[PDB]
């Protein structure tokens with residue numbers, strides 16, 4: 044039930060950038076969400092082999108997780124905040140797609156997504 048390679052956290056032919064908003068997404072948004080009691084399942088790529096979820100990547104073709112996002116922010120991999128925000132949204136949606144409404148992991152994603160939205164509602168100038 045193999046795992047694919049994790050998403051890239053660097054790419055030499057993609058241009059880098061740093062903005063106040065991206066800095067905030069690392070220092071305030073991600074680093075605060077990371078400490079939430081429901082954050083742990085999202086801190087690394089889904090290990091389908093270890094979790095006995097042999098169809099996870101048969102279903103999910105654009106995997107994402109906060110470990111990957113953190114490294115991308117640390118790499119200055121993103122062009123802008125919206126690009127990073129898209130990754131968070133992909134992570135949450137993957138969780139909703141693979142699982143069913145009401146599942147424990149879905150309850151965790153829903154709580155984190157609310158907190159995430161609360162925190163990006165206002166970004167620095």
Ligand SMILES: COc1cc(Nc2ncc3c(n2)N(C(C)C)c2ccccc2C(=O)N3C)ccc1N1CCN(C)CC1
Pocket residue numbers: 083084085086087088089090094096138141142148
């Ligand atoms: C035990 O460790 C971990 C276990 C997990 N396990 C995990 N990682 C990801 C899970 C997921 N479980 N769950 C439940 C089962 C929640 C799911 C169960 C069924 C279907 C889907 C999921 C699921 O969607 N996700 C995100 C993730 C990260 C860690 N960490 C290891 C140490 N690392 C420093 C911090 C994070």
